[PDB]
Structure 1
Amino acid sequence: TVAYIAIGSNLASPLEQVNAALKALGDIPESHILTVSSFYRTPPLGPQDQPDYLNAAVALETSLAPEELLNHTQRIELQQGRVRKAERWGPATLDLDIMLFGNEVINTERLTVPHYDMKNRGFMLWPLFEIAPELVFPDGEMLRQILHTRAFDKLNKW
């Protein structure tokens, strides 16, 4: 199955973090990277006392179960120093979010797929569209169409 993973970093030299994350994603067992997006510099959504993000997306072919893939993305986050604080949508050395897991719909305590907010976020949809322009969401909507309709600002390269 192809999993689409959003990558964000706004602490501790985001370019180095995203390069490290890509290497580590490629080291996840029973998986392989298919496609990587460009790197974009995006203003923070949420609290404004934080740096701009590097945002990217990757397509990862995997035979892992979705929660097992999450275990591995979370491990990578911790290998790159991720800390979490009370404030919602605070900064991160590395944030790996599962946007889509094939065409699945997943509703569990640990995992909600499609990612709950991705359709509202150019910093997620634009990198996804670069690597999967023909993508169709589980609800039947086309990514390309959503982007044209919502008319989110185009992103700047990192």
Structure 2
Amino acid sequence: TVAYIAIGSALASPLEQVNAALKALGDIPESHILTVSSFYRTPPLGPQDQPDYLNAAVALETSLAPEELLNHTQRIELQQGRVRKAERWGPRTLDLDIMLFGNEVINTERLTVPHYDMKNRGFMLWPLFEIAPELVFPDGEMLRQILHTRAFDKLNKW
């Protein structure tokens, strides 16, 4: 099963945090990386201008069940990243999201696939389109049509 995973990171030096994360993803049992998108650069949310965020997408072939894959992405987030001390509820310093899991639709208490907001997020869709331009979502919508209709601005490269 081909899973597509969004990776984000702005902490310390994003390039080596993300590279360590990719190595971790590749070491997930019963799984191997098919391809990784380019690394992209997105500005921080808020006017205060935090560090720049590094965004990418990974195609991972896996025979794990979706919740088993979740277990590993959560483990990697714990091992490779941390919580913001002034915002424990805020996003961690390394973000992994399972965007898509084959053609599966999953609405459990722990796991929602497709990612619930990805169709509204250029920073998830553009890297995905780079590695999977002909992708079709479980509901039949084409990735290309979403990017075209919604007219999301392209992302700058890291």
Q: TM above 0.5, one fold?
A: yes
Partner SS state of residue 59, structure 1: strand
Moved more, 140-149 or 84-93: 84-93
| Closer, same or farther: CA 102–47 of 1 in aligned 2, 3 Å | farther
CA displacement, residues 62-96 of structure 1 (integer Å, 9 cap, x when unaligned) = 00011110110111111112226795984532100
Query: d(CA) in 2 for partners of 1:123 and 1:89?
Result: 22
Change (3 A) 1:137 1:14: same
Residues 123 and 155, structure 1, Cα contact 8 Å, conserved in 2: yes
CA contact (8 A) 2:36 2:131 kept: yes
User: Normalising to structure 1: TM-score of the pair?
Assistant: 0.92
Q: Structure 1 CA distance, aligned partners of 2:105 and 2:84? A: 26
Cα distance change on mapping 1:10 and 1:45 into 2, 3 Å: same
CA drift of 1:45 comes to: 4.3
| Distance in 1 between residues matched to 2:25 and 2:134, nearest whole Å | 23
Change over 3 Å in CA distance of 1:46–1:60 after alignment to 2:
farther
Query: Which structure 2 segments of 5+ residues have no match?
Result: none
Q: TM-score, normalised by structure 2?
A: 0.92
User: Any gaps of 5 or more consecutive residues in structure 1?
Assistant: none
Identity percentage of aligned residues: 99
Shift of the 152–4 alpha-carbon distance from structure 1 to 2, 3 Å rule, reads same
- In the TM superposition, residue 21 of structure 1 has moved relative to its aligned partner by 0.7
Give the direction of change, closer, same or farther, for the CA distance of 1:47–1:11 in structure 2 (3 Å limit).
farther
Deviation at 1:17, TM superposition (A): 1.0
Which of 77-86 and 60-69 deviates more? 77-86
Q: Is the 8 A contact 1:46 1:89 kept in 2?
A: no
Distance of aligned partners of 1:29 and 1:121 in 2 relative to their CA distance in 1, 3 Å threshold: same
Q: 1:137 to 1:89 in 2, by over 3 A?
A: farther
- Whether the aligned pair in 2 keeps the contact of 1:10 and 1:53 (CA below 8 Å) is yes
Cα pair 2:42 2:123 within 8 Å, conserved:
yes
How many residues align structurally? 158
Per mean C-alpha deviation after superposition, the further-off stretch among 124-133 and 88-97 is: 88-97
Map Cα deviations across residues 17-75 of structure 1 (whole Å, 9 max, x no partner). 11001111000000000010000010234685632210000000000011110110111
Aligned to 2:51, the other structure's residue is in SS state coil
Q: Measured at CA, do residues 42 and 64 of structure 1 come closer, stay the same or move farther in structure 2, by a change above 3 Å? A: same
RMSD, aligned α-carbons: 2.0
**Counterparts in 2 of 1:132 and 1:20: CA distance versus 1, 3 Å:** same
Whole-Å Cα distance in 1 between the matches of residues 69 and 120 of structure 2?
24
DSSP 3-state at the match of 1:25 = helix
Whether the aligned pair in 2 keeps the contact of 1:105 and 1:138 (CA below 8 Å) is yes
